[PDB]
Amino acid sequence: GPGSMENFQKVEKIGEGTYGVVYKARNKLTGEVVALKKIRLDTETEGVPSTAIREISLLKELNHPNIVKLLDVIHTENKLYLVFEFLHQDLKKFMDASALTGIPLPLIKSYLFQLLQGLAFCHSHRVLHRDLKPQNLLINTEGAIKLADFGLARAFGVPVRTYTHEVVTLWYRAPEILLGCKYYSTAVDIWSLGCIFAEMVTRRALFPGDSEIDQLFRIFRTLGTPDEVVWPGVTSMPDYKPSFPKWARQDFSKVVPPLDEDGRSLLSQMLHYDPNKRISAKAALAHPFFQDVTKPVPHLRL
Amino acid sequence: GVNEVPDYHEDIHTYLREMEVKCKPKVGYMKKQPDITNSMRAILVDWLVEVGEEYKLQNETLHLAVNYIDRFLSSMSVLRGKLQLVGTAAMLLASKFEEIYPPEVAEFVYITDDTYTKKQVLRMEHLVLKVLAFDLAAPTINQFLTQYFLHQQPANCKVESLAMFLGELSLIDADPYLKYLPSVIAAAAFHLALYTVTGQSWPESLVQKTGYTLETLKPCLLDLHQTYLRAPQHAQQSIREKYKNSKYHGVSLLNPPETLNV
Protein backbone atom coordinates (compact mmCIF):
# COMPACT_ATOMS: atom_id res chain seq x y z
CA GLY A 1 0.00 0.00 0.00
CA PRO A 2 2.47 2.76 -1.16
CA GLY A 3 -0.14 4.75 -3.12
CA SER A 4 -2.42 7.63 -2.18
CA MET A 5 -5.21 9.11 -4.31
CA GLU A 6 -3.49 12.50 -4.54
CA ASN A 7 -0.96 11.13 -7.07
CA PHE A 8 -3.65 10.01 -9.53
CA GLN A 9 -5.44 12.13 -12.13
CA LYS A 10 -8.78 10.69 -13.31
CA VAL A 11 -8.90 10.75 -17.12
CA GLU A 12 -12.31 9.27 -17.89
CA LYS A 13 -14.80 6.56 -16.86
CA ILE A 14 -14.13 3.29 -18.68
CA GLY A 15 -16.65 0.93 -17.16
CA GLU A 16 -18.86 -0.20 -14.34
CA GLY A 17 -18.67 -3.51 -12.48
CA THR A 18 -19.78 -5.16 -9.24
CA TYR A 19 -18.67 -2.27 -6.98
CA GLY A 20 -19.49 0.42 -9.47
CA VAL A 21 -17.23 2.74 -11.40
CA VAL A 22 -13.89 1.99 -13.03
CA TYR A 23 -11.82 5.01 -14.15
CA LYS A 24 -8.79 5.30 -16.40
CA ALA A 25 -6.21 7.41 -14.54
CA ARG A 26 -2.66 8.62 -14.75
CA ASN A 27 0.00 8.51 -12.04
CA LYS A 28 1.21 12.11 -12.02
CA LEU A 29 4.66 11.15 -10.72
CA THR A 30 5.59 8.11 -12.83
CA GLY A 31 3.36 8.67 -15.92
CA GLU A 32 1.79 5.27 -15.46
CA VAL A 33 -1.72 4.77 -16.84
CA VAL A 34 -3.89 2.66 -14.55
CA ALA A 35 -7.48 1.63 -14.01
CA LEU A 36 -8.99 2.58 -10.63
CA LYS A 37 -11.78 0.30 -9.42
CA LYS A 38 -13.67 2.18 -6.68
CA ILE A 39 -15.62 0.25 -3.98
CA ARG A 40 -17.71 2.49 -1.63
CA LEU A 41 -17.93 1.05 1.93
CA ASP A 42 -20.24 3.70 3.49
CA THR A 43 -22.99 2.16 1.32
CA GLU A 44 -21.87 -1.18 2.77
CA THR A 45 -23.55 -2.17 6.07
CA GLU A 46 -21.93 -5.62 5.96
CA GLY A 47 -18.43 -4.12 5.84
CA VAL A 48 -15.95 -5.01 3.09
CA PRO A 49 -17.69 -7.15 0.45
CA SER A 50 -16.62 -10.76 0.06
CA THR A 51 -16.27 -10.20 -3.70
CA ALA A 52 -13.59 -7.59 -2.97
CA ILE A 53 -11.89 -9.70 -0.24
CA ARG A 54 -11.52 -12.59 -2.67
CA GLU A 55 -10.55 -10.40 -5.60
CA ILE A 56 -7.80 -8.55 -3.69
CA SER A 57 -6.40 -11.51 -1.73
CA LEU A 58 -6.28 -13.80 -4.77
CA LEU A 59 -4.89 -11.25 -7.24
CA LYS A 60 -2.05 -10.24 -4.88
CA GLU A 61 -0.65 -13.77 -5.40
CA LEU A 62 -1.28 -14.09 -9.17
CA ASN A 63 1.66 -12.38 -10.92
CA HIS A 64 1.51 -13.49 -14.57
CA PRO A 65 1.76 -11.61 -17.90
CA ASN A 66 -1.73 -12.87 -18.89
CA ILE A 67 -3.43 -11.94 -15.63
CA VAL A 68 -4.37 -8.28 -15.19
CA LYS A 69 -2.08 -6.97 -12.49
CA LEU A 70 -3.31 -5.45 -9.21
CA LEU A 71 -0.74 -2.71 -8.52
CA ASP A 72 -2.04 -1.38 -5.23
CA VAL A 73 -4.99 -1.12 -2.80
CA ILE A 74 -5.83 2.40 -1.36
CA HIS A 75 -7.85 1.75 1.81
CA THR A 76 -9.52 4.91 3.07
CA GLU A 77 -12.05 4.72 5.92
CA ASN A 78 -14.96 5.36 3.51
CA LYS A 79 -13.64 4.06 0.17
CA LEU A 80 -11.50 1.24 -1.27
CA TYR A 81 -9.59 1.81 -4.52
CA LEU A 82 -8.01 -1.05 -6.43
CA VAL A 83 -5.27 0.20 -8.77
CA PHE A 84 -4.85 -2.06 -11.81
CA GLU A 85 -2.64 -1.98 -14.88
CA PHE A 86 -4.64 -0.38 -17.70
CA LEU A 87 -5.66 -2.29 -20.85
CA HIS A 88 -7.54 -0.22 -23.52
CA GLN A 89 -10.08 -2.82 -24.66
CA ASP A 90 -11.89 -6.11 -23.98
CA LEU A 91 -12.36 -9.05 -26.39
CA LYS A 92 -16.13 -8.49 -26.71
CA LYS A 93 -15.67 -4.89 -27.89
CA PHE A 94 -12.86 -5.95 -30.22
CA MET A 95 -15.06 -8.65 -31.75
CA ASP A 96 -18.01 -6.29 -32.27
CA ALA A 97 -16.27 -3.16 -33.45
CA SER A 98 -13.24 -4.38 -35.39
CA ALA A 99 -13.77 -8.05 -36.22
CA LEU A 100 -16.59 -7.70 -38.78
CA THR A 101 -14.57 -9.45 -41.54
CA GLY A 102 -13.28 -11.64 -38.72
CA ILE A 103 -10.34 -12.22 -36.39
CA PRO A 104 -7.41 -13.67 -38.45
CA LEU A 105 -6.36 -17.20 -37.39
CA PRO A 106 -2.85 -16.03 -36.22
CA LEU A 107 -4.47 -13.63 -33.74
CA ILE A 108 -6.94 -16.27 -32.55
CA LYS A 109 -4.09 -18.74 -31.93
CA SER A 110 -2.07 -16.11 -30.05
CA TYR A 111 -5.04 -15.01 -27.92
CA LEU A 112 -6.13 -18.55 -27.06
CA PHE A 113 -2.50 -19.54 -26.31
CA GLN A 114 -2.10 -16.60 -23.92
CA LEU A 115 -5.48 -17.28 -22.26
CA LEU A 116 -4.41 -20.88 -21.57
CA GLN A 117 -1.15 -19.62 -20.06
CA GLY A 118 -3.07 -17.28 -17.72
CA LEU A 119 -5.59 -19.97 -16.82
CA ALA A 120 -2.96 -22.65 -16.15
CA PHE A 121 -1.25 -20.19 -13.81
CA CYS A 122 -4.55 -19.72 -11.92
CA HIS A 123 -5.17 -23.47 -11.61
CA SER A 124 -1.52 -24.02 -10.60
CA HIS A 125 -2.21 -21.51 -7.80
CA ARG A 126 -5.44 -23.24 -6.65
CA VAL A 127 -7.64 -20.44 -8.10
CA LEU A 128 -10.85 -21.01 -10.15
CA HIS A 129 -11.91 -17.95 -12.17
CA ARG A 130 -15.56 -18.94 -12.71
CA ASP A 131 -16.54 -16.04 -14.99
CA LEU A 132 -14.48 -16.38 -18.18
CA LYS A 133 -16.26 -14.53 -20.99
CA PRO A 134 -15.04 -12.03 -23.65
CA GLN A 135 -16.08 -9.02 -21.54
CA ASN A 136 -13.58 -10.17 -18.84
CA LEU A 137 -10.61 -10.57 -21.19
CA LEU A 138 -8.62 -7.38 -21.70
CA ILE A 139 -6.38 -6.60 -24.68
CA ASN A 140 -3.62 -4.00 -24.94
CA THR A 141 -2.06 -2.26 -27.96
CA GLU A 142 0.89 -4.75 -27.94
CA GLY A 143 -1.26 -7.82 -28.70
CA ALA A 144 -1.46 -9.17 -25.13
CA ILE A 145 -4.73 -10.55 -23.73
CA LYS A 146 -5.25 -11.05 -19.99
CA LEU A 147 -7.75 -12.60 -17.55
CA ALA A 148 -9.64 -9.93 -15.59
CA ASP A 149 -12.46 -9.58 -13.07
CA PHE A 150 -11.63 -11.99 -10.26
CA GLY A 151 -14.76 -10.94 -8.28
CA LEU A 152 -16.27 -14.40 -8.83
CA ALA A 153 -13.03 -16.34 -8.30
CA ARG A 154 -12.38 -18.80 -5.47
CA ALA A 155 -9.41 -20.41 -3.76
CA PHE A 156 -9.95 -24.16 -3.97
CA GLY A 157 -8.73 -27.11 -1.90
CA VAL A 158 -7.64 -30.51 -3.19
CA PRO A 159 -9.87 -32.39 -3.68
CA VAL A 160 -12.51 -29.68 -4.21
CA ARG A 161 -15.45 -29.34 -1.87
CA THR A 162 -18.93 -28.05 -2.82
CA TYR A 163 -18.81 -24.35 -3.79
CA THR A 164 -21.37 -21.75 -4.88
CA HIS A 165 -23.77 -23.19 -7.49
CA GLU A 166 -24.83 -21.57 -10.78
CA VAL A 167 -21.60 -19.53 -11.11
CA VAL A 168 -20.34 -18.55 -14.58
CA THR A 169 -22.32 -16.33 -16.94
CA LEU A 170 -24.94 -18.61 -18.46
CA TRP A 171 -23.67 -18.76 -22.07
CA TYR A 172 -20.23 -19.85 -20.79
CA ARG A 173 -21.40 -22.24 -18.05
CA ALA A 174 -20.34 -25.90 -18.07
CA PRO A 175 -22.82 -28.83 -18.16
CA GLU A 176 -21.79 -30.15 -14.73
CA ILE A 177 -22.93 -26.85 -13.21
CA LEU A 178 -26.17 -26.83 -15.22
CA LEU A 179 -26.86 -30.40 -13.99
CA GLY A 180 -26.35 -29.36 -10.35
CA CYS A 181 -23.08 -31.29 -9.77
CA LYS A 182 -22.15 -31.63 -6.10
CA TYR A 183 -18.56 -30.85 -7.20
CA TYR A 184 -16.98 -28.84 -9.97
CA SER A 185 -13.32 -28.12 -10.66
CA THR A 186 -10.79 -26.64 -13.07
CA ALA A 187 -12.68 -28.12 -16.02
CA VAL A 188 -15.39 -25.42 -15.66
CA ASP A 189 -12.89 -22.71 -16.67
CA ILE A 190 -11.80 -24.85 -19.66
CA TRP A 191 -15.42 -25.16 -20.79
CA SER A 192 -15.71 -21.35 -20.81
CA LEU A 193 -12.49 -20.95 -22.83
CA GLY A 194 -13.81 -23.51 -25.33
CA CYS A 195 -16.95 -21.39 -25.72
CA ILE A 196 -14.67 -18.35 -26.14
CA PHE A 197 -12.50 -20.17 -28.74
CA ALA A 198 -15.56 -20.93 -30.89
CA GLU A 199 -16.78 -17.33 -30.38
CA MET A 200 -13.54 -15.77 -31.63
CA VAL A 201 -13.86 -17.78 -34.87
CA THR A 202 -17.55 -16.92 -35.58
CA ARG A 203 -18.00 -13.64 -33.59
CA ARG A 204 -21.17 -15.13 -32.06
CA ALA A 205 -21.80 -17.00 -28.83
CA LEU A 206 -21.62 -20.78 -29.19
CA PHE A 207 -24.51 -21.58 -26.80
CA PRO A 208 -26.72 -18.47 -26.27
CA GLY A 209 -29.38 -19.87 -23.90
CA ASP A 210 -32.23 -17.83 -22.34
CA SER A 211 -32.55 -20.24 -19.39
CA GLU A 212 -30.66 -23.03 -17.58
CA ILE A 213 -32.76 -25.66 -19.36
CA ASP A 214 -32.56 -23.82 -22.70
CA GLN A 215 -28.80 -23.63 -22.26
CA LEU A 216 -28.53 -27.38 -21.66
CA PHE A 217 -30.79 -28.06 -24.63
CA ARG A 218 -28.63 -25.86 -26.89
CA ILE A 219 -25.53 -27.73 -25.74
CA PHE A 220 -27.18 -31.14 -26.24
CA ARG A 221 -28.31 -30.22 -29.80
CA THR A 222 -24.71 -29.35 -30.75
CA LEU A 223 -22.69 -32.02 -28.92
CA GLY A 224 -25.45 -34.67 -28.63
CA THR A 225 -27.36 -35.54 -25.45
CA PRO A 226 -24.84 -37.26 -23.10
CA ASP A 227 -25.41 -40.83 -21.92
CA GLU A 228 -23.49 -43.17 -19.57
CA VAL A 229 -21.01 -44.07 -22.37
CA VAL A 230 -19.77 -40.55 -23.09
CA TRP A 231 -20.18 -39.41 -19.48
CA PRO A 232 -20.32 -42.02 -16.64
CA GLY A 233 -22.40 -40.53 -13.81
CA VAL A 234 -24.44 -38.17 -16.04
CA THR A 235 -27.83 -39.89 -15.62
CA SER A 236 -27.43 -39.95 -11.80
CA MET A 237 -26.71 -36.20 -11.46
CA PRO A 238 -29.12 -34.16 -9.24
CA ASP A 239 -30.71 -32.23 -12.14
CA TYR A 240 -30.47 -34.92 -14.82
CA LYS A 241 -33.88 -35.99 -16.07
CA PRO A 242 -34.53 -39.18 -18.09
CA SER A 243 -37.21 -37.16 -20.00
CA PHE A 244 -34.39 -35.11 -21.60
CA PRO A 245 -34.62 -35.24 -25.45
CA LYS A 246 -32.01 -37.51 -26.95
CA TRP A 247 -30.27 -35.50 -29.68
CA ALA A 248 -27.63 -37.03 -31.97
CA ARG A 249 -24.10 -35.58 -31.76
CA GLN A 250 -23.23 -33.65 -34.89
CA ASP A 251 -20.00 -33.80 -36.87
CA PHE A 252 -17.79 -31.23 -35.16
CA SER A 253 -16.88 -29.75 -38.56
CA LYS A 254 -20.47 -28.50 -38.64
CA VAL A 255 -20.20 -26.76 -35.26
CA VAL A 256 -17.54 -24.29 -36.48
CA PRO A 257 -17.28 -24.91 -40.24
CA PRO A 258 -14.21 -22.67 -40.87
CA LEU A 259 -12.06 -24.42 -38.26
CA ASP A 260 -9.17 -26.64 -39.52
CA GLU A 261 -8.49 -30.17 -38.18
CA ASP A 262 -6.13 -29.01 -35.38
CA GLY A 263 -8.63 -26.37 -34.29
CA ARG A 264 -11.51 -28.87 -34.21
CA SER A 265 -9.42 -31.38 -32.28
CA LEU A 266 -8.59 -28.77 -29.62
CA LEU A 267 -12.14 -27.39 -29.47
CA SER A 268 -13.62 -30.88 -29.09
CA GLN A 269 -11.28 -31.58 -26.17
CA MET A 270 -12.23 -28.34 -24.40
CA LEU A 271 -15.96 -29.17 -24.71
CA HIS A 272 -15.78 -32.81 -23.63
CA TYR A 273 -18.84 -33.63 -21.52
CA ASP A 274 -16.97 -35.65 -18.91
CA PRO A 275 -15.13 -33.04 -16.71
CA ASN A 276 -12.50 -35.77 -16.05
CA LYS A 277 -11.64 -36.19 -19.79
CA ARG A 278 -11.82 -32.49 -20.73
CA ILE A 279 -8.37 -31.12 -21.46
CA SER A 280 -6.49 -29.08 -18.80
CA ALA A 281 -4.99 -25.67 -19.63
CA LYS A 282 -1.54 -27.14 -19.02
CA ALA A 283 -2.00 -29.92 -21.64
CA ALA A 284 -3.79 -27.64 -24.10
CA LEU A 285 -0.59 -25.53 -24.35
CA ALA A 286 1.06 -28.46 -26.14
CA HIS A 287 -1.75 -28.92 -28.71
CA PRO A 288 -0.58 -28.91 -32.40
CA PHE A 289 -3.01 -26.04 -33.03
CA PHE A 290 -0.33 -23.81 -31.44
CA GLN A 291 2.61 -25.20 -33.44
CA ASP A 292 2.87 -21.96 -35.47
CA VAL A 293 2.32 -19.24 -32.78
CA THR A 294 5.42 -16.96 -32.76
CA LYS A 295 4.06 -13.81 -31.03
CA PRO A 296 6.64 -13.23 -28.20
CA VAL A 297 5.52 -13.77 -24.57
CA PRO A 298 4.43 -10.46 -22.93
CA HIS A 299 6.85 -9.42 -20.17
CA LEU A 300 5.63 -9.50 -16.55
CA ARG A 301 4.42 -6.19 -15.04
CA LEU A 302 5.78 -4.57 -11.88
CA GLY B 1 -10.43 -37.46 -11.61
CA VAL B 2 -10.55 -33.69 -12.16
CA ASN B 3 -11.98 -32.99 -8.64
CA GLU B 4 -8.51 -34.11 -7.47
CA VAL B 5 -6.85 -31.92 -10.17
CA PRO B 6 -4.22 -34.50 -11.30
CA ASP B 7 -2.60 -31.90 -13.60
CA TYR B 8 -2.20 -29.30 -10.79
CA HIS B 9 -2.08 -30.99 -7.36
CA GLU B 10 1.75 -31.11 -7.29
CA ASP B 11 2.09 -27.49 -8.42
CA ILE B 12 -0.53 -26.61 -5.78
CA HIS B 13 1.23 -28.57 -3.00
CA THR B 14 4.54 -26.82 -3.80
CA TYR B 15 2.84 -23.40 -3.76
CA LEU B 16 1.09 -24.08 -0.44
CA ARG B 17 4.46 -25.12 1.07
CA GLU B 18 5.97 -21.78 0.00
CA MET B 19 2.96 -19.79 1.28
CA GLU B 20 2.75 -21.45 4.71
CA VAL B 21 6.25 -20.08 5.30
CA LYS B 22 5.14 -16.55 4.27
CA CYS B 23 1.87 -16.82 6.28
CA LYS B 24 3.59 -18.18 9.39
CA PRO B 25 2.94 -16.42 12.75
CA LYS B 26 5.87 -15.42 14.98
CA VAL B 27 6.58 -18.44 17.24
CA GLY B 28 7.29 -16.37 20.34
CA TYR B 29 4.70 -13.53 20.14
CA MET B 30 2.73 -14.49 23.21
CA LYS B 31 5.65 -13.68 25.52
CA LYS B 32 5.67 -10.23 23.87
CA GLN B 33 1.93 -9.77 24.59
CA PRO B 34 1.80 -8.08 28.04
CA ASP B 35 -1.89 -8.62 28.72
CA ILE B 36 -2.72 -11.94 27.02
CA THR B 37 -1.65 -15.56 27.57
CA ASN B 38 -1.79 -18.95 25.87
CA SER B 39 -4.80 -19.82 28.06
CA MET B 40 -6.77 -16.73 27.01
CA ARG B 41 -6.08 -17.62 23.36
CA ALA B 42 -7.10 -21.25 24.04
CA ILE B 43 -10.39 -19.93 25.46
CA LEU B 44 -10.90 -17.78 22.34
CA VAL B 45 -10.16 -20.57 19.88
CA ASP B 46 -12.45 -22.99 21.71
CA TRP B 47 -15.24 -20.36 21.57
CA LEU B 48 -14.64 -19.94 17.82
CA VAL B 49 -14.95 -23.73 17.53
CA GLU B 50 -18.44 -23.37 19.07
CA VAL B 51 -19.35 -20.43 16.80
CA GLY B 52 -18.43 -22.61 13.81
CA GLU B 53 -20.73 -25.43 14.96
CA GLU B 54 -23.46 -22.99 15.94
CA TYR B 55 -23.44 -21.53 12.41
CA LYS B 56 -22.51 -24.75 10.59
CA LEU B 57 -19.38 -23.12 9.12
CA GLN B 58 -16.68 -25.10 7.31
CA ASN B 59 -13.75 -26.39 9.35
CA GLU B 60 -11.59 -24.59 6.76
CA THR B 61 -13.18 -21.33 7.88
CA LEU B 62 -12.21 -22.03 11.50
CA HIS B 63 -8.59 -22.74 10.48
CA LEU B 64 -8.34 -19.52 8.42
CA ALA B 65 -9.65 -17.45 11.34
CA VAL B 66 -7.01 -18.83 13.71
CA ASN B 67 -4.35 -18.12 11.06
CA TYR B 68 -5.58 -14.52 10.86
CA ILE B 69 -5.68 -14.14 14.67
CA ASP B 70 -2.15 -15.47 15.22
CA ARG B 71 -0.71 -13.34 12.43
CA PHE B 72 -2.49 -10.27 13.85
CA LEU B 73 -1.21 -10.92 17.40
CA SER B 74 2.31 -11.29 15.94
CA SER B 75 2.42 -7.52 15.24
CA MET B 76 -0.37 -5.93 17.34
CA SER B 77 -0.54 -5.83 21.16
CA VAL B 78 -4.13 -6.37 22.39
CA LEU B 79 -5.70 -5.88 25.83
CA ARG B 80 -7.61 -8.93 27.16
CA GLY B 81 -10.91 -7.00 26.80
CA LYS B 82 -10.31 -6.71 23.02
CA LEU B 83 -9.07 -10.22 22.21
CA GLN B 84 -12.62 -11.42 21.42
CA LEU B 85 -13.12 -8.45 19.08
CA VAL B 86 -10.03 -9.51 17.10
CA GLY B 87 -11.33 -13.09 16.97
CA THR B 88 -14.81 -12.00 15.88
CA ALA B 89 -13.41 -9.84 13.04
CA ALA B 90 -11.12 -12.70 12.10
CA MET B 91 -14.04 -15.18 11.87
CA LEU B 92 -16.07 -12.67 9.84
CA LEU B 93 -13.28 -12.27 7.29
CA ALA B 94 -12.70 -16.03 7.15
CA SER B 95 -16.42 -16.58 6.55
CA LYS B 96 -16.54 -13.98 3.76
CA PHE B 97 -13.53 -15.65 2.13
CA GLU B 98 -14.46 -19.29 2.52
CA GLU B 99 -18.25 -19.68 3.03
CA ILE B 100 -20.92 -19.90 0.37
CA TYR B 101 -23.37 -18.24 2.80
CA PRO B 102 -21.32 -16.31 5.43
CA PRO B 103 -23.36 -15.17 8.47
CA GLU B 104 -24.37 -11.53 8.47
CA VAL B 105 -22.42 -9.03 10.57
CA ALA B 106 -25.35 -8.76 12.99
CA GLU B 107 -24.91 -12.43 13.89
CA PHE B 108 -21.23 -11.89 14.66
CA VAL B 109 -22.29 -8.97 16.89
CA TYR B 110 -24.92 -11.23 18.52
CA ILE B 111 -22.49 -14.08 19.39
CA THR B 112 -20.33 -11.61 21.38
CA ASP B 113 -23.32 -11.14 23.74
CA ASP B 114 -23.41 -7.42 22.78
CA THR B 115 -19.90 -6.91 24.25
CA TYR B 116 -19.04 -5.04 21.03
CA THR B 117 -21.01 -2.90 18.57
CA LYS B 118 -21.47 -3.39 14.83
CA LYS B 119 -19.29 -0.34 14.26
CA GLN B 120 -16.56 -1.91 16.43
CA VAL B 121 -16.65 -5.23 14.59
CA LEU B 122 -16.48 -3.46 11.21
CA ARG B 123 -13.58 -1.19 12.25
CA MET B 124 -11.68 -4.22 13.55
CA GLU B 125 -12.44 -5.92 10.19
CA HIS B 126 -10.70 -3.01 8.43
CA LEU B 127 -7.75 -3.04 10.82
CA VAL B 128 -7.21 -6.78 10.41
CA LEU B 129 -7.27 -6.34 6.64
CA LYS B 130 -4.70 -3.55 6.99
CA VAL B 131 -2.43 -5.58 9.28
CA LEU B 132 -2.59 -8.69 7.02
CA ALA B 133 -2.44 -6.50 3.88
CA PHE B 134 -5.40 -8.61 2.63
CA ASP B 135 -3.17 -11.74 2.46
CA LEU B 136 -6.12 -13.95 3.41
CA ALA B 137 -5.51 -17.02 1.15
CA ALA B 138 -3.46 -18.80 3.80
CA PRO B 139 -2.63 -22.54 3.71
CA THR B 140 -4.19 -24.45 6.58
CA ILE B 141 -3.74 -27.86 8.17
CA ASN B 142 -6.91 -28.88 6.30
CA GLN B 143 -5.60 -28.01 2.84
CA PHE B 144 -2.67 -30.37 3.45
CA LEU B 145 -4.79 -33.12 5.11
CA THR B 146 -7.25 -33.42 2.23
CA GLN B 147 -4.30 -33.95 -0.15
CA TYR B 148 -2.62 -36.46 2.12
CA PHE B 149 -5.94 -38.33 2.31
CA LEU B 150 -5.62 -39.19 -1.38
CA HIS B 151 -2.71 -41.47 -0.38
CA GLN B 152 -4.80 -43.90 1.72
CA GLN B 153 -5.15 -47.44 0.31
CA PRO B 154 -8.09 -47.58 0.52
CA ALA B 155 -9.94 -44.47 1.79
CA ASN B 156 -11.12 -44.73 5.42
CA CYS B 157 -13.51 -42.14 6.89
CA LYS B 158 -12.54 -42.79 10.53
CA VAL B 159 -8.91 -42.06 9.61
CA GLU B 160 -9.91 -38.88 7.77
CA SER B 161 -12.17 -37.65 10.61
CA LEU B 162 -9.60 -38.55 13.29
CA ALA B 163 -6.85 -36.64 11.46
CA MET B 164 -9.16 -33.62 11.19
CA PHE B 165 -9.87 -33.84 14.92
CA LEU B 166 -6.22 -33.97 15.90
CA GLY B 167 -5.47 -31.06 13.58
CA GLU B 168 -8.24 -29.02 15.22
CA LEU B 169 -6.96 -29.85 18.73
CA SER B 170 -3.62 -28.27 17.77
CA LEU B 171 -5.32 -24.93 17.04
CA ILE B 172 -6.08 -24.58 20.77
CA ASP B 173 -2.54 -24.61 22.15
CA ALA B 174 -0.07 -21.99 20.87
CA ASP B 175 2.50 -23.87 22.96
CA PRO B 176 3.60 -25.92 21.28
CA TYR B 177 1.88 -25.78 17.88
CA LEU B 178 2.95 -22.27 16.92
CA LYS B 179 6.35 -23.98 16.40
CA TYR B 180 4.98 -26.14 13.58
CA LEU B 181 3.97 -25.37 9.99
CA PRO B 182 0.46 -26.50 8.93
CA SER B 183 1.93 -29.09 6.56
CA VAL B 184 3.87 -30.73 9.41
CA ILE B 185 1.00 -30.81 11.91
CA ALA B 186 -1.16 -32.25 9.14
CA ALA B 187 1.49 -34.91 8.55
CA ALA B 188 1.69 -35.83 12.23
CA ALA B 189 -2.12 -35.81 12.52
CA PHE B 190 -2.54 -38.04 9.47
CA HIS B 191 0.09 -40.49 10.70
CA LEU B 192 -1.35 -40.57 14.19
CA ALA B 193 -4.90 -41.12 12.91
CA LEU B 194 -3.81 -43.85 10.49
CA TYR B 195 -1.81 -45.62 13.16
CA THR B 196 -4.65 -45.36 15.71
CA VAL B 197 -7.36 -46.76 13.42
CA THR B 198 -5.48 -49.19 11.14
CA GLY B 199 -2.05 -49.79 12.68
CA GLN B 200 -0.44 -48.52 9.45
CA SER B 201 2.14 -45.69 9.16
CA TRP B 202 3.03 -42.54 7.14
CA PRO B 203 3.12 -43.95 3.56
CA GLU B 204 6.27 -43.89 1.40
CA SER B 205 4.15 -42.21 -1.29
CA LEU B 206 3.82 -39.22 1.07
CA VAL B 207 7.54 -39.29 1.75
CA GLN B 208 7.84 -38.86 -2.04
CA LYS B 209 5.35 -35.99 -2.13
CA THR B 210 6.37 -34.07 1.00
CA GLY B 211 9.99 -35.06 1.66
CA TYR B 212 8.93 -35.64 5.30
CA THR B 213 9.68 -38.91 7.15
CA LEU B 214 8.72 -40.22 10.57
CA GLU B 215 12.12 -38.87 11.69
CA THR B 216 11.31 -35.33 10.56
CA LEU B 217 7.77 -35.58 12.03
CA LYS B 218 8.89 -37.15 15.33
CA PRO B 219 8.89 -33.94 17.48
CA CYS B 220 5.42 -32.86 16.32
CA LEU B 221 4.15 -36.47 16.64
CA LEU B 222 5.31 -36.58 20.27
CA ASP B 223 3.45 -33.33 21.04
CA LEU B 224 0.27 -34.33 19.21
CA HIS B 225 0.34 -37.74 20.87
CA GLN B 226 0.50 -36.12 24.33
CA THR B 227 -2.22 -33.66 23.28
CA TYR B 228 -4.43 -36.61 22.20
CA LEU B 229 -3.73 -38.51 25.45
CA ARG B 230 -4.56 -35.49 27.62
CA ALA B 231 -7.54 -34.31 25.60
CA PRO B 232 -10.28 -35.51 28.06
CA GLN B 233 -8.49 -33.46 30.76
CA HIS B 234 -7.91 -30.24 28.80
CA ALA B 235 -9.77 -27.13 30.01
CA GLN B 236 -11.27 -26.65 26.50
CA GLN B 237 -13.69 -29.38 25.39
CA SER B 238 -15.58 -27.90 22.43
CA ILE B 239 -13.64 -29.87 19.80
CA ARG B 240 -14.10 -33.20 21.56
CA GLU B 241 -17.83 -32.44 21.88
CA LYS B 242 -18.02 -31.51 18.19
CA TYR B 243 -16.27 -34.69 17.08
CA LYS B 244 -18.62 -36.93 19.12
CA ASN B 245 -21.10 -36.19 16.30
CA SER B 246 -21.88 -38.81 13.65
CA LYS B 247 -20.93 -36.29 10.94
CA TYR B 248 -17.36 -36.89 12.12
CA HIS B 249 -17.88 -40.61 12.66
CA GLY B 250 -17.77 -40.17 16.46
CA VAL B 251 -13.95 -40.15 16.33
CA SER B 252 -13.39 -38.24 19.59
CA LEU B 253 -14.72 -41.39 21.29
CA LEU B 254 -11.89 -43.52 19.82
CA ASN B 255 -9.16 -44.59 22.27
CA PRO B 256 -5.70 -43.03 21.66
CA PRO B 257 -2.83 -45.63 21.47
CA GLU B 258 -0.68 -45.85 24.62
CA THR B 259 2.55 -45.79 22.51
CA LEU B 260 3.69 -44.95 18.95
CA ASN B 261 6.61 -47.43 18.74
CA VAL B 262 9.05 -45.00 17.08
Swiss-Prot record, chain A:
Where in the sequence is Phosphotyrosine found?
Y19, Y23
Phosphothreonine PTM sites in chain numbering: T18, T164
Q: Which residues of this protein are catalytic?
A: D131
In Gene Ontology terms, what is one molecular function of this protein? Answer: ATP binding
Query: What are the coiled-coil residue ranges?
Result: none
Q: Which positions are annotated as binding Mg(2+)?
A: N136, D149
Q: Which cofactor does it need?
A: Mg(2+)
Top-rank taxon, per record: Eukaryota
Q: Where in this chain does the record put each Protein kinase domain?
A: 8-290
The UniProt similarity line reads:
Belongs to the protein kinase superfamily. CMGC Ser/Thr protein kinase family. CDC2/CDKX subfamily.
| Protein name listed in UniProt | Cyclin-dependent kinase 2
The record lists the organism as Homo sapiens (Human)
From Swiss-Prot, chain B:
The protein's PTM annotation reads: Polyubiquitinated via 'Lys-11'-linked ubiquitin by the anaphase-promoting complex (APC/C), leading to its degradation by the proteasome. Deubiquitinated and stabilized by USP37 enables entry into S phase. Ubiquitinated during the G1 phase by the SCF(FBXO31) complex, leading to its proteasomal degradation.
Where in the cell is the protein located?
Nucleus; Cytoplasm
Where's it mainly located?
nucleus
| Top-level taxon of the source organism | Eukaryota
**Which keywords annotate this record?**
Acetylation, Cell cycle, Cell division, Cyclin, Cytoplasm, Mitosis, Nucleus, Phosphoprotein, Ubl conjugation
Q: Where is the signal peptide?
A: none
Q: What one GO molecular function would you report for this record?
A: cyclin-dependent protein serine/threonine kinase regulator activity
Q: Name one GO biological process term.
A: G2/M transition of mitotic cell cycle
Q: Give Gene Ontology CC terms.
A: cyclin A2-CDK2 complex; cyclin-dependent protein kinase holoenzyme complex; cytoplasm; microtubule organizing center; nucleus
- Identify its protein family: Belongs to the cyclin family. Cyclin AB subfamily.
Q: How does it assemble?
A: Interacts with the CDK1 and CDK2 protein kinases to form serine/threonine kinase holoenzyme complexes. Interacts with CDK1 (hyperphosphorylated form in G1 and underphosphorylated forms in S and G2). Interacts with CDK2; the interaction increases from G1 to G2. Interacts (associated with CDK2 but not with CDK1) with SCAPER; regulates the activity of CCNA2/CDK2 by transiently maintaining CCNA2 in the cytoplasm. Forms a ternary complex with CDK2 and CDKN1B; CDKN1B inhibits the kinase activity of CDK2 through conformational rearrangements. Interacts with INCA1.
Function of this protein? Cyclin which controls both the G1/S and the G2/M transition phases of the cell cycle. Functions through the formation of specific serine/threonine kinase holoenzyme complexes with the cyclin-dependent protein kinases CDK1 and CDK2. The cyclin subunit confers the substrate specificity of these complexes and differentially interacts with and activates CDK1 and CDK2 throughout the cell cycle.
This one is known as: Cyclin-A2
What phylogenetic lineage does the species belong to?
A: Eukaryota, Metazoa, Chordata, Craniata, Vertebrata
Q: Which gene encodes it?
A: CCNA2
Interval of the full protein contained in this chain: 170 to 430 of 430
